[PDB]
């Protein structure tokens with residue numbers, strides 16, 4: 001009831017929340033168990049005329065089915081395309097559910113290769129034009145940007161120009177974060193440089209959404225660089 005952004009202990013595993021970020025922009029929030037602990041994660045929904053563009057799954061098949069049901073209840077427009085912003089399960093787990101619901105699924109070739117090698121679900125379509133740091137391409141109502149290696153080598157960020165919303169995905173941490181999250185596939189040395197590229201490219205961002213946790217403003221970018229430095233040590 002508070003209308004505040006929902007946190008890990010407020011979402012049972014299997015349920016999905018939506019949160020209105022701006023006109024035609026929502027985040028989606030779900031929770032999942034991994035290695036015996038429970039974590040929240042975010043994705044994005046962007047209105048695309050009378051259709052919706054989805055950014056990232058809800059971290060699992062059941063969660064992603066629940067996401068589609070929540071979208072139908074709260075928005076009532078069809079999801080026609082999805083982009084996964086890197087290869088981990090919190091981004092691609094649920095792609096098979098999307099594909100069986102008629103959603104066209106996309107990711108960079110780097111993400112597709114990494115997902116395949118890991119045994120994770122694989123988006124159908126490859127997004128070219130994103131292989132060099134600083135690259136950007138348009139995809140419906142968003143811009144996709146490859147900042148360089150950070151949380152993962154393939155991580156993409158997403159900008160919604162109509163609303164100045166920057167979806168950082170897992171390359172960006174929330175302000176309360178005290179660690180750099182799951183760093184198994186990260187490049188802690190390159191991460192600050194990749195964040196600097198995001199800061200330079202999107203200086204008018206008004207809302208910044210992390211891959212996990214609460215949205216805020218541009219301060220999330222500098223905070224992320226700071227915590228990555230601290231974790232590395």
Ligand SMILES: CC(=O)O[C@@H](C)c1cccc2c(-c3ccc(CS(N)(=O)=O)c(F)c3)c(C(=O)O)[nH]c12
Pocket residue numbers: 034039040088089090151170177180181182183184185211212213
């Ligand atoms: C290899 C890989 O990453 O697998 C993915 C599916 C994965 C599994 C489990 C946890 C994470 C985290 C993670 C971990 C801790 C925190 C702080 S806390 N207070 O506990 O919530 C957080 F915000 C995010 C992340 C991420 O850093 O993006 N990714 C995760």
Ligand SMILES: [Zn+2]
Pocket residue numbers: 086088090151152170
């Ligand atoms: Zn990840």
Ligand SMILES: [Zn+2]
Pocket residue numbers: 041088090170211212
């Ligand atoms: Zn993540």
